Design a protein around this ligand. Structure first.
Ligand SMILES: C[C@@H]1CC[C@@]2(OC1)O[C@H]1C[C@H]3[C@@H]4CC=C5C[C@@H](OCCC(CO[C@H]6O[C@H](CO)[C@@H](O[C@H]7O[C@H](CO)[C@@H](O)[C@H](O)[C@H]7O)[C@H](O)[C@H]6O)CO[C@H]6O[C@H](CO)[C@@H](O[C@H]7O[C@H](CO)[C@@H](O)[C@H](O)[C@H]7O)[C@H](O)[C@H]6O)CC[C@]5(C)[C@H]4CC[C@]3(C)[C@H]1[C@@H]2C
Ligand SMILES: COC1=C(OC)C(=O)C(C/C=C(\C)CC/C=C(\C)CC/C=C(\C)CC/C=C(/C)CC/C=C(\C)CC/C=C(\C)CC/C=C(\C)CC/C=C(/C)CCC=C(C)C)=C(C)C1=O
Ligand SMILES: CCCCCCCCCCCCCCCCCC(=O)O[C@@H](COC(=O)CCCCCCCCCCCCCCC)COP(=O)(O)OCC[N+](C)(C)C
Ligand SMILES: CCCCCCCCCCCCCCCCCC(=O)O[C@@H](COC(=O)CCCCCCCCCCCCCCC)COP(=O)(O)OC[C@H](O)CO
Ligand SMILES: CCCCCCCCCCCCCCCCCC(=O)O[C@@H](COC(=O)CCCCCCCCCCCCCCC)COP(=O)(O)OC[C@H](O)CO
Ligand SMILES: CCCCCCCCCCCCCCCCCCCC(=O)O[C@H](COC(=O)CCCCCCCCCCCCCC)COP(=O)(O)OCCN
Ligand SMILES: CCCCCCCCCCCCCCCCCCCC(=O)O[C@H](COC(=O)CCCCCCCCCCCCCC)COP(=O)(O)OCCN
Ligand SMILES: CCCCCCCCCCCCCCCCCCCC(=O)O[C@H](COC(=O)CCCCCCCCCCCCCC)COP(=O)(O)OCCN
Ligand SMILES: CCCCCCCCCCCCCCCCCCCC(=O)O[C@H](COC(=O)CCCCCCCCCCCCCC)COP(=O)(O)OCCN
Ligand SMILES: CCCCCCCCCCCCCCCCCC(=O)OC[C@H](COP(=O)(O)O)OC(=O)CCCCCCCCCCCCCCCCC
Ligand SMILES: CCCCCCCCCCCCCCCCCC(=O)OC[C@H](COP(=O)(O)O)OC(=O)CCCCCCCCCCCCCCCCC
Ligand SMILES: COC1=C(OC)C(=O)C(C/C=C(\C)CC/C=C(\C)CC/C=C(/C)CC/C=C(\C)CCC=C(C)C)=C(C)C1=O
Lengths: 488, 94, 101, 100, 324, 43, 56, 174
């Protein structure tokens, strides 16, 4: 009996460690004897440790995660794809946590519950990746969402943070209701919620004239929920406001991990299921809309956070082009894009968090940065050029695939849109470089140097961004492996 | 069978009529306190706990040890939450 | 409760015990298992101590880190030992001990 | 005709939630209430289908969805409370400062 | 179904009479403890006092203050009164003596109890009076707080019985009354019943002298009477529930032919009378808690103990395989 | 010296201590006694 | 002014260390979390200058 | 007919939820909607869910909403607006949803037209399933804690998040 639970050792450990940290934090934060010490950094270090131990347990036990698969079948499904997705999710969570300590001590954000909520949301996203039934998928999505709602409003006396939370909760709850409605329609039409059963029922028919309008609209509503989650246009406008109004570590965490989890869900639901061309057309139109709107709105922005939010919207458009084309290379390119975008976003938010120690808000606040911190201005410039997709930086992969699929699926309007939006993006990315290097403002802002954690993370992500294309084989092989494991 | 609910409806109708008769015969001759929200939240949580207890209580003879320990784990999570509330002063009305 | 230990990906090494008992797995702990266990626990205690200095609770922080490390290290050692007995990990020692007792 | 009548009941509840979103641009509390109405309609959809299909999966998920609805309302009303506390008012013109 | 209204009236009317005389019995017992005579002028031994008081109330002019919640103000007492009445549809007085033999009767009682709070809340809010509103909020919070412990004790009984059917709960006590092994649970249940019915030592609405205005202070004539009647009917119901769950309902004390001679309804009535006497006795014996103290007792004492009893009973019954 | 700290906790929080003892018995019986009773039945 | 300068320049090693730690602890604040905890952190008197040297 | 009555009550009560000027009134109508829903559940034979909808939706969730809305003391000026100018946008959105979504089951689940013949005699009774009938409660409890226990525990995690968030966002300890 005990050995059956080897399939959930990683999750058991992280949940138990989260409980231990909750108890530790609440017991000593309330201690008069110790004079109510702030425990955000102490619990943060212990939680980073817990995340790393979870990663060790998961990575080193790859076969064991598939033990007792028949017993666990109606609860979840673990395979190679989920293996790599969960490893990447844990790595992203560890990096995001490591970027938070200067924020904890200098702002004096003393709430250790922040770390606990991050860990519980990580548990939720882990269960999201392995979900193999509509019920499990919904429950894990809701756990993740509720944790985000709470942490988005963590600055509870701030107008901005409270506004972010309110908008997030209302729009999140609305989208979740729409998705749940879709799930109910699919169950009513097919008598099934398990992904295997849905695959068997729906395969071979798609729209064979006598199409289940119940099945067709259930798929549509579920897709609407998914598109809200990935911040695809027209279900996107929550994202810029929430990203800007939330505390910056929250914004960094939301920018990466939920995308990984929800894209795992989307792959395993749609790609593994079957209504077909309708849904790929959904993602096609949403990709085009996201690219165009992201480019234009980002061009309008004068503030750093909003610029990065709109940039992420545009990039999810680029990524969803891969899902749309419906090929093994499409899935592989989507995964490569997710990985590279995540690393670049981690780099960008490490810089943003470093600059938040002097309250960076506007793009113009970067003036004369090439004088006051030359190596920081260069590092940030490499990130921008990578965001623009200039070769040989890592960001060039997403552009290359966008056009590869445009000429592979046979889509020339898509190629035209890609060209135009890429040029617009390059303009608003090099505007930052111009501000740091070319401008001569009358008043300068002198920034405090970053802590060791962010400097090390920045140093590694900056080598990856510059040098990835010299040795890109491991990512290519692992992503091809994952794309194949979805069906075999 | 749902047959036994019909007398309840007729009982409700009669009780309502008695209420109207009794009440109608004499016509012939800005300070928000968060602790209420908090007690509402606690009641909601333990209301759901009782809700989940009901099927478990009637099903103990069939679920045996596995069901017992799964409910115990459920209770462990909820009781950790309760300990958190207790330490934070949510249960103190002074 | 019906149970089925059968894994999706078959074991690539001889199966000494398909579903080893808890105490059998613990008694199967090797020197390397104990090294992994002790290393994880020691690192966790060290992190607890160092991160506890600024709040002033280095002792209790050491205890908390040590509890996390003890649980994680035991889970990791159990994972390795059970995987060896089940044939999922290289298990030369288990096979040698099995072919003799 | 039973199944079409049970489904249109839940359907009118869902459409009412949608209309409540549409008609309450100055009243975000009612917007939250409309979202609960939609969640109730979905829950009813699972229960009706469970009976119609003679299957228990609709019933398990209905209970879990009730748990989600409870947690959602708790957290949402907390966020409402803190927004009101910061502004002293619930009017929508005081929650429009993030834009662009 | 044509005879169903006759059965319903045969429940409701004697219940209203019983409430009218419970008020008199409370006055009499309180007086006798206090070395005085209660009402003994209006009728012989004061037995006509309840009719006179009810007649006075119906002949009293209603006030209906100039509030903006004209409908809600009068409907709140109707709601609480109807809820007090409808719980008796599932109460069995003897084997086969019950209006609705609900299989889900225990949860139905819990639902009715949970619904009881709305009359008090609406009366407080609709009355256009800050004192009534504050008192109603405090009373509502107290009732919801003690409802948790009531529900957990219900779960303990359910674990022992394996069915939500009240008659089955009674017949499961043929071997032994549940109040013997679960005596602390019964004490907890009685105290929680006191708190849930806003009764002494938990009667905040009665604490006008303590600068705590009750939720019904603006009510006159028959709305106030409806609140009062619902409260006393709920006291009778809580006594009946204590009898059903722990004292074996209609069962005799000993399974002997001498005890089986007297009908089960009489056994049930006698146990209910004991519990009503304890209600009155407790009101006569002790002072009252403050609101904060009783809230602390609800959340810090009775909830943990109720949960612990759930765990202990279930674990013991699972271990030795004594489950129903 | 944690043997009067437990004494002090029991003296100051009798309800919590009683709840812990009652629930702990309820957890101990299935965890320890039940497998013993199952083992004695096999032989 | 001489009083505050004389007081600072005559401090021993131990007091210098104590005041370094105290200064670091009270350099920033989270009054919202303190209100959640229901406590009020007060500046220690060894970090408060006399009123006769303050600008007002 | 009975479903017509309950659906009409639900329709009117829901319109009152979304259209009442006073938010306290909206909460009270919401409570009427849950009562009607419970009636439907009783018609379906799901008495456990019928009772739980009263216990949780009305007994706990609506109470929370009522406590919060009552202490807010919202003035109508802060949330008032004329809705006559929304009739067209609601007309198109409602109609499209109406035409699509009230009739989605019609092609898959074609109704049986009631004829002028007693079909009740064609009801086949299998007594084998009637020897030991299961309540809704015990059928659900047979599954929640053993075969689908992981989802049960994840729901517990969701409730824990609710508790933590409620404390962290609103607590001001005296
Ligand atoms: C604690 C607090 C207090 C508040 C509260 O809780 C909380 O308090 C709680 C108290 C609750 C009430 C409790 C109780 C009820 C009664 C229920 O109402 C029963 C209705 C059902 C039962 O009705 C019949 O059931 C049997 C017949 O079915 C009868 O059996 C005969 O027939 C047998 C067979 O020959 C013989 O063998 C027997 O010998 C012979 O006697 C039986 O006598 C009779 O009862 C369903 O019936 C219908 O359903 C049919 C199907 O749809 C419809 O058929 C139609 O459509 C068909 C096509 O589809 C066409 O083919 C048809 O031609 C065409 O007619 C039709 O409309 C109609 O029949 C309606 C809900 C309500 C009000 C609750 C509301 C909510 C509360 C107030 C709660 C509230 C919230
Ligand atoms: C001091 O505390 C006390 C109260 O609270 C202040 C009381 O309300 C009351 C009295 C309240 C009552 C007697 C209510 C009794 C009501 C009933 C028995 C049901 C109605 C009885 C009637 C005589 C009304 C008759 C109405 C009709 C339409 C006539 C047709 C039948 C007492 C005795 C008391 O001691
Ligand atoms: C060809 C690529 C495609 C096009 C993209 C080009 C992107 C760059 C744009 C080119 C235009 C000109 C760029 C000018 C940058 C050169 C100046 C520079 O970066 O110097 C840095 C140097 O920045 C670095 O530190 C770069 C380190 C990267 C290490 C990469 C080498 C890896 C192996 C080397 C092993 C170690 C050294 C071996 C020999 C000792 C000095 O930084 P400061 O901020 O001035 O001061 C630093 C502080 N302090 C000197 C006190 C330490
Ligand atoms: C307020 C009380 C708090 C209590 C906290 C302590 C207990 C918490 C629960 C800890 C897990 C179980 C610990 C008890 C050890 C004894 C277990 C045991 O006796 O083994 C039985 C088996 O027990 C179990 O396997 C149940 C384990 C409960 C599940 C606990 C969750 C652990 C992790 C789950 C991972 C899922 C992800 C979690 C999602 C949040 C043997 O039963 P059987 O195989 O002979 O037959 C089965 C049954 O009799 C017929 O149905
Ligand atoms: C890799 C992670 C290993 C474990 C990390 C320990 C978690 C807590 C350490 C955070 C660093 C720290 O403690 O900072 C304090 C002090 O920083 C340290 O001294 C480092 C503490 C320990 C970290 C390195 C020790 C060895 C670690 C080896 C791995 C274990 C505060 O600095 P200050 O206010 O005294 O600065 C004044 C001075 O001018 C700074 O220039
Ligand atoms: C972020 C930056 C990532 C770090 C860059 C460098 C990482 C390289 C470190 C690994 C080298 C040593 C590996 C040792 C090894 O092979 O053992 C395996 C560990 O797997 C592993 O360590 C796998 C590491 C996977 C890295 C994350 C890949 C993410 C893919 C991108 C997807 C993103 C989209 C998701 C929606 C387990 O043994 P095993 O080989 O038998 O295990 C597969 C069974 N089938
Ligand atoms: C100046 C030149 C403008 C030319 C516009 C022509 C648009 C027609 C595009 C078209 O042919 O339809 C498909 C895509 O359309 C579309 O994708 C729909 C148009 C773009 C959708 C989103 C547009 C939103 C723009 C965002 C800002 C709007 C703000 C509005 C408030 C492309 O054919 P195909 O590639 O599918 O061939 C499938 C073969 N496999
Ligand atoms: C791939 C392209 C090429 C990459 C090349 C990689 C080469 C390997 C890297 C070589 C590293 C060289 C430096 C090694 C010596 C530094 C040792 C750090 C000592 C240390 O204890 O640092 C502590 C902080 O932790 C820290 O600062 C460490 C944590 C910093 C984050 C590191 C990552 C952790 C989370 C994983 C994220 C993964 C993201 C992937 C998506 C305390 O420091 P202190 O004493 O100065 O006091 C700080 C005030 N509080
Ligand atoms: C998912 C995982 C994502 C990881 C992305 C790839 C790692 C990050 C790449 C950016 C930093 C490394 C730049 C590449 C180094 C430039 C020289 C490349 C090279 O040919 O050296 C070989 C690779 O060394 C190396 O291994 C490169 C240094 C380690 C990085 C050693 O040559 P070799 O013979 O040992 O390997 C078999 C090759 N023929
Ligand atoms: C969130 C969930 C909260 C509940 C906590 C869940 C995990 C804690 C479980 C503790 C009981 C484990 C147990 O007794 O198993 C040994 C025990 C052996 O008994 P022994 O032979 O007397 O040692 O195993 C069994 O035979 C019972 C199996 C119970 C199911 C275990 C499910 C959880 C597995 C994760 C354990 C992680 C490492 C800890 C193992 C060492 C514990 C001493
Ligand atoms: C895992 C399954 C259940 C999960 C949930 C429950 C987990 C258990 C609760 C954990 C909460 C944290 C407990 C912290 C206890 C701290 C005790 C304390 O005050 O210590 C101070 C106390 C006295 O030292 P002082 O603080 O200097 O007075 O103890 C120590 O500091 C001892 C330090 C030496 C320990 C090193 C070895 C640690 C190995 C792991 C054990
Ligand atoms: C400058 O002049 C003006 C306009 O003109 C730009 C206006 O509009 C308006 C006011 C009216 C508006 C804004 C209605 C437009 C709203 C829409 C379409 C709702 C959808 C929301 C967004 C953000 C659009 C995103 C959707 C896209 C890009 C396409 C949908 C998706 C796919 C094709 C997949 C005013 C006053 C105005 O003065």
């Amino acid at each position: 009996m005990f050995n059956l639970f080897l399939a959930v050792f990683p999750e058991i450990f992280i949940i138990n460690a989260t409980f231990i940290l909750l108890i530790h934090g609440v017991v000593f934060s309330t201690s008069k004897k110790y004079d109510y010490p702030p425990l955000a950094s102490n619990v943060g270090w212990l939680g980073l440790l817990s995340v790393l131990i979870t990663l060790l347990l998961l990575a080193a036990g790859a076969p064991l995660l598939t033990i007792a698969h028949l017993f666990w079948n109606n609860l979840f499904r673990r395979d190679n794809f989920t293996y790599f997705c969960q490893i990447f999710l844990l790595l992203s969570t560890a990096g995001t946590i490591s970027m938070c300590f200067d924020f904890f001590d200098q702002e004096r954000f003393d709430a250790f519950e922040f770390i606990v909520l991050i860990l519980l949301s990580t548990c939720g996203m882990l269960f999201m990746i392995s979900a193999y039934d509509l019920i499990a998928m919904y429950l894990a999505i809701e756990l993740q969402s509720l944790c985000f709602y709470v942490i988005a409003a963590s600055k509870r006396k701030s107008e901005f943070s409270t506004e972010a939370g309110l908008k997030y909760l209302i729009l999140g709850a609305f989208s979740s209701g729409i998705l749940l409605f879709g799930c109910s329609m699919i169950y009513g039409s097919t008598g099934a919620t398990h992904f295997d059963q849905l695959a068997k029922i729906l395969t071979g028919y798609e729209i064979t004239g006598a199409r289940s309008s119940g099945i067709f609209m259930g798929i549509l509503f579920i897709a609407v929920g998914f598109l809200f989650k990935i911040t695809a246009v027209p279900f996107h406008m929550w994202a810029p406001d929430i990203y800007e109004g939330s505390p910056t570590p929250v914004t960094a965490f939301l920018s990466i991990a939920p995308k990984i989890s929800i894209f795992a869900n989307i792959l395993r639901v749609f790609i593994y299921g079957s209504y077909g061309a309708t849904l790929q057309q959904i993602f096609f139109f949403c990709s085009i809309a996201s690219m165009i709107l992201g480019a234009l709105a980002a061009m309008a922005q004068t503030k750093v956070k909003r610029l990065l939010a709109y940039s992420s919207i545009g990039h999810v458009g680029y990524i969803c082009i891969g899902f749309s084309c419906g090929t093994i290379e499409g899935i592989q390119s989507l995964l490569i894009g997710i990985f590279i975008y995540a690393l670049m976003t981690m780099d960008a938010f490490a810089i943003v968090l470093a600059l938040r120690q002097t309250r960076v808000k506007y793009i113009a606040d970067l003036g004369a940065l090439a004088k006051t911190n030359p190596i920081l201005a260069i590092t940030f410039s490499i990130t921008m050029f990578s965001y623009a997709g200039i070769p040989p930086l890592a960001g060039f992969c997403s552009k290359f695939y966008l056009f590869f699929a445009a000429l592979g699926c046979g889509a020339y309007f898509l190629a035209l849109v890609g060209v135009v939006t890429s040029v617009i993006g390059c303009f608003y990315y090099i505007r930052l470089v111009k501000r740091m290097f070319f401008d001569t403002p009358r008043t300068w802002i002198l920034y405090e140097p970053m802590d060791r954690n962010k400097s090390l993370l920045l140093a590694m992500t900056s080598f990856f961004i510059t040098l990835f294309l010299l040795y890109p084989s491991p990512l290519f092989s692992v992503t091809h492996q994952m794309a194949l494991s979805l069906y075999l | 069978m749902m047959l036994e609910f019909a007398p309840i409806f007729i009982y409700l109708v009669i009780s309502l009529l008695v209420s109207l008769i009794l009440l109608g015969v004499p016509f012939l001759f800005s300070r928000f306190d968060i602790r209420f929200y908090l007690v509402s939240i606690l009641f909601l949580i333990f209301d759901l706990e009782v809700t989940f207890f009901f099927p478990w209580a009637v099903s103990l003879n069939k679920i045996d040890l596995f069901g017992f320990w799964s409910m115990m784990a459920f209770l462990f999570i909820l009781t950790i939450g309760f300990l958190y509330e207790w330490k934070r002063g949510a249960l103190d009305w002074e | 409760m019906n149970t089925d230990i059968t894994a999706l990906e078959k074991a690539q090494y001889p199966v000494v015990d398909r579903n080893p008992a808890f105490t059998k797995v613990v008694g199967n702990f090797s020197t390397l298992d104990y090294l992994r266990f002790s290393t994880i626990t020691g690192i966790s205690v060290t992190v607890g101590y160092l991160s506890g200095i600024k709040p002033g609770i280095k002792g209790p922080s050491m205890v908390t880190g040590g509890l996390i490390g003890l649980m994680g290290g035991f889970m990791y050692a159990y994972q390795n030992s059970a995987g060896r007995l089940m044939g999922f990990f290289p298990n030369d020692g288990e096979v040698a001990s099995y072919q003799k007792r | 005709m039973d199944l079409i009548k049970y489904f249109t009941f839940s359907m009118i509840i869902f459409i009412l939630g949608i209309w409540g979103i549409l008609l309450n641009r100055r009243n975000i509390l009612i917007m939250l209430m409309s979202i609960e109405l939609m969640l109730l309609a979905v829950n009813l959809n699972f229960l009706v289908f469970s009976v119609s299909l003679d299957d228990m999966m609709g019933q398990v998920f209905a209970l879990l969805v009730l748990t989600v609805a409870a947690a959602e309302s708790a957290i949402g009303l907390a966020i409402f409370v803190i927004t009101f506390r910061v502004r002293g008012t619930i009017a929508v013109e005081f929650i429009n400062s993030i834009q662009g | 179904y044509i005879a169903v209204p006759a059965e319903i009236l045969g429940i409701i009317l004697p219940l209203l009479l019983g409430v009218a005389f419970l008020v008199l019995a409370e006055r009499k017992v309180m007086a006798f403890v206090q070395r005085r005579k209660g009402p003994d002028v209006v009728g012989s031994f004061g037995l006509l006092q309840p009719l006179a008081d009810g007649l006075k109330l119906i002949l009293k002019e209603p006030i209906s203050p100039s509030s903006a919640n004209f409908f809600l103000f009068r409907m709140a007492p109707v709601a609480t009164f109807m809820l007090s009445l409808v719980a008796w549809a599932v109460v069995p007085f003897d084997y086969g003596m019950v209006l609705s033999d609900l299989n889900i009767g225990l949860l139905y009682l819990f639902a009715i109890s949970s619904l009881g709070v709305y009359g008090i809340i609406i009366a407080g809010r609709s009355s256009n009076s800050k004192y009534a509103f504050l008192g109603a909020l405090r009373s509502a919070a107290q009732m919801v707080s003690y409802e948790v412990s009531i529900g957990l004790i219900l779960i303990t009984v359910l674990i022992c019985v394996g069915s939500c059917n009240l008659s089955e709960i009674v017949m499961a006590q043929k071997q032994i009354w549940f109040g013997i092994p679960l005596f602390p649970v019964l004490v907890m249940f009685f105290i929680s019943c006191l708190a849930e019915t806003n009764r002494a030592p938990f009667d905040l609405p009665e604490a006008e002298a303590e600068l705590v205005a009750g939720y019904n202070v603006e009510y006159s004539s028959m709305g106030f009477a409806l609140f009062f009647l619902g409260e006393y009917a709920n006291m009778i119901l809580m006594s009946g529930l204590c009898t059903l769950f722990f004292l074996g309902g209609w069962l005799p004390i000993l399974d002997l032919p001498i005890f089986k001679k007297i009908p089960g309804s009489i056994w049930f009535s006698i146990k209910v009378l004991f519990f009503l006497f304890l209600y009155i006795w407790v009101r006569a014996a002790f002072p009252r808690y403050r609101y904060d103290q009783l809230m602390g007792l609800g959340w810090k004492v009775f909830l943990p103990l109720s949960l612990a009893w759930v765990v202990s009973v279930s674990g013991l019954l699972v271990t030795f395989q004594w489950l129903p | 010296p944690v043997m009067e700290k437990l004494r002090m906790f029991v003296a100051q929080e009798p309800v919590v201590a009683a709840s812990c003892l009652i629930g702990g018995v309820g957890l101990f019986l299935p965890a320890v006694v039940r497998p013993i009773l199952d083992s004695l039945e096999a032989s | 002014l001489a009083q505050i300068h004389a007081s600072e320049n005559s401090k021993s090693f131990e007091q210098i260390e104590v005041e370094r730690a105290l200064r670091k602890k009270y350099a920033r604040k989270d009054e919202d979390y303190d209100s959640m905890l229901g406590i009020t952190r007060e500046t220690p008197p060894e970090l408060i200058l006399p009123d006769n040297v303050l600008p007002g | 007919m009975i479903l017509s009555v309950l659906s009409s009550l639900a329709l009117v009560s829901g319109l009152m939820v979304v259209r009442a000027k006073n938010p306290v009134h909206s909460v009270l109508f919401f409570i009427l909607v849950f009562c009607d829903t419970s009636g439907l559940l009783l018609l379906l034979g799901l008495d456990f869910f019928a009772m739980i909808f009263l216990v949780v939706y009305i007994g706990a969730i609506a109470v929370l909403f009522l406590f919060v809305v009552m202490m807010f003391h919202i003035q109508i000026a802060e949330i008032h607006e004329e809705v006559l100018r929304y009739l067209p946008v609601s007309g198109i959105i409602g109609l499209i949803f109406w035409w699509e979504m009230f009739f989605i089951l019609d092609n898959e689940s074609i109704p049986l037209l009631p004829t002028q013949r007693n079909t009740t005699s064609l009801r086949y009774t299998v007594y084998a399933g009637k020897v030991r009938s299961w309540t809704n409660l015990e059928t659900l409890g047979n599954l929640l804690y053993t075969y689908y226990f992981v989802w049960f525990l994840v729901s517990s995690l969701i409730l824990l998040v609710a508790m933590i968030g409620a404390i962290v966002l609103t607590m001001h300890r005296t």
